[PDB]
Amino acid sequence: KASLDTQSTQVETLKRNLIQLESKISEAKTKKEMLKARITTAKAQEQLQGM
C-alpha cells in the first residue's frame, strides 16, 4: 500500500510534468509564430522591389 501510494504520487507528478512539457512546446510554437510574422515583413520589402 505504501509503495502503491508512492507510485500513485509519482505517476501524478509525471502527468503534471507531461502537461508542463506540453505547455512548453506550445510556447515554442508561439515564439516560432512571432518569427514567421517577421519573415512576412521581409517578403513585403522584396515585393516593393518587384513593383
Place this chain on the structure above:
Amino acid sequence: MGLFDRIKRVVSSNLNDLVNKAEDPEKMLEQAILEMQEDLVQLRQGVAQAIAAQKRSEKQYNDAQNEINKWQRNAQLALQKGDENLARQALERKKTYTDTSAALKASLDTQSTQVETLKRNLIQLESKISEAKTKKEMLKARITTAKAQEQLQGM
C-alpha cells in the same frame, strides 16, 4: 595594386551582366509573389496550428479546473473527516493548480492576441497581393496600346 583594381572593373561588368539576364518585370514579381503565396499558406497553416494548439491548451486548462473542483470536494471531505494532514494536502494542491491555471490563462490570452494579429497580418498580406494584381492590370492595359500601334503597321 592592380589586382585590387582589376576586380573593380570585373565586378562592374559582372554585376551589369547578371542583372540584365534576370531583368524581367513579370518574372521578378512572380517569383516574389509565389514565395509570398507560399508564406501566406504557411502562415494560415500556422494560424490553424496555433488555433489547434490553443484548443489543446484550453482542454488542458479545463482539466485543471475540473481537478481543482475535485480537490475542493476532497478538502471539504477532509474537514468532515477531521484529519488535519488530509486537509492541508488538499489546500496545497489547489494553490499550485490555481497558479498554473492562471499562468495558462495568461498564456492563452497572449496566444489569442497573437493569432488575431497574425490573422490581421494575413488579411493585410492578402490585400497586398490584390494591389500588386491591380498594378499588373495597369501594365497589361499599356501593352494593348503598344499592340494597337503594331496593328496600324499591318494595315
